[PDB]
UniProtKB/Swiss-Prot annotation:
This is Potassium channel toxin alpha-KTx 2.5. Changing Y37F: No loss of activity. The record marks K28 as: Basic residue of the functional dyad. It comes from Centruroides limbatus. GO terms for molecular function: ion channel inhibitor activity; potassium channel regulator activity; toxin activity. Transmembrane segments: none annotated. Keywords: Disulfide bond, Ion channel impairing toxin, Neurotoxin, Potassium channel impairing toxin, Secreted, Toxin, Voltage-gated potassium channel impairing toxin. One of its GO terms (cellular component) is extracellular region. Disulfide bonds join C7-C29, C13-C34, C17-C36. The lineage of its organism: Eukaryota, Metazoa, Ecdysozoa, Arthropoda, Chelicerata. Belongs to the short scorpion toxin superfamily. Potassium channel inhibitor family. Alpha-KTx 02 subfamily. It is found in: Secreted.
Length: 39
């Protein structure tokens, strides 16, 4: 998934990823915005 969590690092997208997107869900950054892994 992609959220409009704007990023300097994966860190700041990891709590929304684990919010709504999944149990062990992960997050990384590219182009200043998140690319969330819902697993």
């Amino acid at each position: 998934t992609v959220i409009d969590v704007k990023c300097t690092s994966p860190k700041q997208c990891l709590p929304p990823c684990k919010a709504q997107f999944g149990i062990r869900a992960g997050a990384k950054c590219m182009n200043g915005k998140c690319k969330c892994y819902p697993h």
